[PDB]
Amino acid sequence: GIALGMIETRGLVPAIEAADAMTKAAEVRLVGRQFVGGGYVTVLVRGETGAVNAAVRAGADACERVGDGLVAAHIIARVHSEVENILPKAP
Amino acid sequence: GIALGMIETRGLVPAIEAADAMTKAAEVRLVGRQFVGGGYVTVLVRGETGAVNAAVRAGADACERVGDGLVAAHIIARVHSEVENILPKAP
Amino acid sequence: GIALGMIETRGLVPAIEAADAMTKAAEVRLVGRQFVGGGYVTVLVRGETGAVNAAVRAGADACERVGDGLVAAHIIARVHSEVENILPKAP
Amino acid sequence: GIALGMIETRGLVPAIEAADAMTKAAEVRLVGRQFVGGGYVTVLVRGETGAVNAAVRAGADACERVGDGLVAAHIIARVHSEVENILPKAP
Amino acid sequence: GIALGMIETRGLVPAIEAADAMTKAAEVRLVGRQFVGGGYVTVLVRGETGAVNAAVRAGADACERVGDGLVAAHIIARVHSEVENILPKAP
Amino acid sequence: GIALGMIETRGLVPAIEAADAMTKAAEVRLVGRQFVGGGYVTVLVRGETGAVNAAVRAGADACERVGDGLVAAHIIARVHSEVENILPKAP
């Protein structure tokens, strides 16, 4: 599956719980954890459409109350192939 | 084409949704995704003048409500040769 | 043990006092100290479930009044295998 | 010419338009684009005194309305030779 | 001596005066100067307990009025050996 | 001489104008320009005690109205040998 799920948080601790809740929620693979600058952290997962939708909803609910909380939660079920050049394949 | 499109966001998730909307909207290549410092991210595209105009406006409309949102959307249809030395050629 | 403890602070001094209180409070190993960006720091410990619970609560109580203070204190007693790829094994 | 022109902005997008407006305004060479930290970006040009004065005035006017806008615009027509050791020669 | 002293400041200038006041105040060795992110800077010294206590008190008083001032001032007279893996030995 | 002068600013443009005013004001060498994190920049000079005093006060008066301005201006006429290990010798 090539659908993409993304959760952005303030700090690394909410991000690490988001990643746990996502990967326990459905069959998805964790491809990236990016320190964006100025406090933001983003975790990326790939999998099938049904799986990525459940994973992102679970991560969003689990990290909102942790540390400085949630920034963004977002799905793109089929990115353009051009966007693959800025998406990591391994953490 | 050598027209330049650029979109700056707060955080990485609005920038990836910006990159996706831009490349599906017209024939543009993604030449870079830059971590600016302090939370800003900038995505950059190249192509013919009309393609880049259609691309930039679609990415702005798409990322506006994603995460912490949109900072800038802007076009330079023919940069001076000088500026090419600070523009990346692939991301 | 493979339970995970995490404490996020504003600045490096509250995080080192957090690491000290955590490791003296129960049998946990210090696997990482991460400079997150924008001032956040995160310290991470591993061990059995009860050791990590006692560790995390002691570090929170210790760093709360140090410097700019505590951001998050949180435990994941069995992370998914997926998340292991973004957790450091030594600092 | 060895006079120096400098424009500092919030974000990379206003900086890239500043560089375009400067180099289209008079004969100057673009020597640097620096990510300062915490959002600031600085572009540096060199050339003759008359040229650097026109270039900086044009860049300042062109970038004020772009993204998060302008921070500083400044000329030094002849830096001390000691200052050359912190001025880049190539972008 | 293995006791640890720590001073965190906003900016590098208050940190450099803190380090001067600490090392002139008692026999301590300067082991680290860390750029934490988002403006914070931390200086670390080691020595005996009596020496580290005088050093930190002097540094704290000397840097409060310099630049953007003091963030934290803190002693741990005997860190756990696990914490040694995140403490530098040389600046 | 081994007296130390230091000026901290918000952004890179006020710091370069600070470096220029300092080196033209008396016989001082520029030993470093440090990107601190979060937007702060620090420039550092060495020389005899009177040269460094004249240098520092001139740089403060010059950069005050440039960009986001001046954070600190400060002199240490004889640092302890300990601190030399965190001071750069050339920029």
Author numbering:
A (entry chain B), B (entry chain A), C (entry chain A), D (entry chain B), E (entry chain B), F (entry chain A): 6 to 96
Task: Show me the paper's own sentences about this structure.
Among diverse BMCs, carboxysomes are specific CO2-fixing BMCs found in all cyanobacteria and many proteobacteria. The carboxysome uses a polyhedral protein shell to encapsulate the key CO2 fixation enzymes, ribulose-1,5-bisphosphate carboxylase/oxygenase (Rubisco) and carbonic anhydrase (CA). Carboxysome shells are typically composed of three groups of structural components that form hexamers, pentamers, and trimers. Here, we generated recombinant α-carboxysome shells of Halothiobacillus neapolitanus by expressing all the shell proteins (involving three CsoS1 hexameric proteins and two CsoS4 pentameric proteins), together with the C-terminal domain of CsoS2 (CsoS2-C) that mediates shell assembly.
